[PDB]
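Notes, p. 3: input format for complexes.
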Amino acid sequence: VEKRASMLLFECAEMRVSDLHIKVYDAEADIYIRKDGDMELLRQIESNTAHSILASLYNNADDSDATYKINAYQAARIVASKSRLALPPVIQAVRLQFNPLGQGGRYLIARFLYTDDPTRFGFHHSHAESFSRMRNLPIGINIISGPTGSGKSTTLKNLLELLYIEKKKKVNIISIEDPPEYEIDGTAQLPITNVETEAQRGEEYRKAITAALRSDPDIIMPGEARDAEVINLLFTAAMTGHQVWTSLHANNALAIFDRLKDQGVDEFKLTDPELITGLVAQRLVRKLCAQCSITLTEYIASGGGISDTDRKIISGHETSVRFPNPRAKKCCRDGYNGRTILAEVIEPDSKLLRLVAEGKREDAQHYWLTSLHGMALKEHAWLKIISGEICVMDAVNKISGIDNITEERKKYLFSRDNEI
Amino acid sequence: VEKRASMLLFECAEMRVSDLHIKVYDAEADIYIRKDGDMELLRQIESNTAHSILASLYNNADDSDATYKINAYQAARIVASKSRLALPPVIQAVRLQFNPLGQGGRYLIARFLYTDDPTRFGFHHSHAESFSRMRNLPIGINIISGPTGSGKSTTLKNLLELLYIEKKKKVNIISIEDPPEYEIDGTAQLPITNVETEAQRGEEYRKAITAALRSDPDIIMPGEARDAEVINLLFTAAMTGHQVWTSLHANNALAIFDRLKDQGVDEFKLTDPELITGLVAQRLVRKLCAQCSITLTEYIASGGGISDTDRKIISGHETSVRFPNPRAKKCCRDGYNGRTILAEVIEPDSKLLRLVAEGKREDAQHYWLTSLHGMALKEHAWLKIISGEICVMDAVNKISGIDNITEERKKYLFSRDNEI
Ligand SMILES: Nc1ncnc2c1ncn2[C@@H]1O[C@H](COP(=O)(O)OP(=O)(O)O)[C@@H](O)[C@H]1O
Ligand SMILES: Nc1ncnc2c1ncn2[C@@H]1O[C@H](COP(=O)(O)OP(=O)(O)O)[C@@H](O)[C@H]1O
Ligand SMILES: [Mg+2]
Ligand SMILES: [Mg+2]
Ligand SMILES: [Zn+2]
Ligand SMILES: [Zn+2]
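Output follows (840 residues plus magnesium ion):
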């Protein structure tokens, strides 16, 4: 049934969910949507209809042949206005993955791609100053780290839009992205055209990187650093006299070096402070509605209670924190509004990189937090909890270790933010 | 349309731009030129005409077959008086790169090659004395480092012209260059003739290097050190009893060793101070017009303002600095005249190389700046800012870290230059 798939994709585009999960059991099938990170239950339908939608989704993709069969792992992709019937204009590509599930069941996951105040998107002012400092530098490599849900592409787009204006259009910027999802002024995104099979995608990505290096690159923005060859090419370009802005998957701002050593980057490449200009780690959390703004007493009287760690976090400022209001008001659909970025930005020095390269993780963290006046993800999350922008539960679900901050550090951060 | 291409190349030769960029969108195409490093907007035309010029440029190259197709990365080269119709005599070769850009768009970059007081080309007198000292030495390897825009080939040409006169024509000099772009007296440039495909160019370069080594080389000037095999051959020739002058791509004068270790040079080759005779890092900046010479007060009254870091740099000498005059006077076309070299020259010792090999970057830099009386790029840029030759904005765009110089170092440099 193509009509059911059309309405399902229309609903997914209208509510702007990220990924769509369909689990088909022997009796009934469940539909889940990943909207703003959290997963919600959309609908529950019969198994035969869901099997029909899954077959229609697989048959309409660009992976024709290797027909739809149960108990098989199958990957596919649907391109808008290119793959048979048309798609909503907000969606460019849908990546489909089919997994077996039990006996007589299926598991489909569709990852949608969307076409889609400039100074701060929830950043701290220290992060903005650090961003300006790294934008002023003409030579170096910058790595943006975080999960797939965080706003890395938007951050890079905004940084390059600011940098193009700041340079008075006297510099050339070249970006390499396999999907040209975000339009950036004066950047000339280079797509990957002859992708062919999935195994040949990396070779064409390397070819695009080398072609961009044979150009006048100056500033380079690859979409993602995935394998060792692309990272080696980027590090070679960084020691040549080019500026590189890249995205990486990592758990921490200081854990970027672990990923680079996993890929194969040598120690003398990571030792230079002039090369590795900046490291950014990002997470996205939900912003509480500023109009409802119920307090801790109202949340306790309504129902529910906080745990011991949440109480320990709250204990510094009781009345300053706010909690979500599930009253279904007209101002907020669910009370969670949009989303904010919690981030940490590090500008390395010689001593910090020497401490990192020697394996002294605790010493390097102490040097960054004390001598360099740094701020981690947990401290920014605690500050946003105290300010009342976000809830404690979402922060402790996204970031761990908020309760481990000492009282002296909390007082120092509060005094530093109140003085400025 | 071949006529439009002919006038475009005539304009590019007449204004002597370095590279030419053409970006073709769905509606209109933009033409950019890289003149004196900065990029300027030449013209805006329609998409069909620009596509016609791009097709005519690709078809007239030496890469016939593999016809001009959209969404494909294509490399080509045009040789003057050899590739079908003739070219201006000032241009030898034009390297063409074609990249996809969006849907129904293209991106062409053409890199022109040109045919093209002897003691200083903007150098400091310490750099001239160091150059004389390295020219007097009969055995060693010298590496010139910098970006592709800096004047490395001209510096090597001038150094070899001075050295041939200083040696009273009692020595043999052999140079290896793939383009024989610069004519040097008594040097006998060896070109690469049977280049065939682009992948076979390195093998013929190695063959030319080995043929030059089978000659009486004495002093050798390869065009560029690109791969590990050529660098290994040059290091083998340096330990044999030959003098090597080479060009390398690097970010810093002391960062040459990082590139050499990346290529595969062992530690005992880099430890010897008698082998690595000198290291030079070069940048090119724009020279302010000496006739207009407006001050800081005139620049402030005309419009615009300097930032906090620029004010911190200026604060030592307010009236000594000068700013560009955009009055469109008859003496200067744009107020930026020609270009000057900001460079750093290091003559290594045993202790400095031992500190570099042990990974002590800060200790090696301190030893070079204090014990060896060295001068970095930032200090030379600051001295040229104070003298009034160049503007602070161009220097801070080209070189970072000018504001990090301490007041004691600034006073020491000013007193040292005023005493001599
Ligand atoms: N303040 C915000 N900052 C970043 N992203 C936001 C923000 N608010 C909403 N979003 C949404 O987060 C989503 C994910 O960001 P994205 O640019 O796609 O990064 P990534 O490529 O790593 O997934 C975006 O679609 C964006 O619309
Ligand atoms: N004082 C100067 N020193 C060096 N180059 C200069 C100077 N003034 C103008 N130029 C120009 O800089 C351009 C680049 O120098 P070049 O010899 O080509 O080095 P490279 O081979 O690394 O590009 C030259 O074409 C030269 O005409
Ligand atoms: Mg992304
Ligand atoms: Mg050269
Ligand atoms: Zn509300
Ligand atoms: Zn003038």
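Chain A touches chain B at residues 136-139, 167, 169-172, 180, 188-191, 193-194, 207-208, 211-212, 214-216, 236, 238-241, 266, 268-269, 271-275, 350, 354 (CB under 8 Å).
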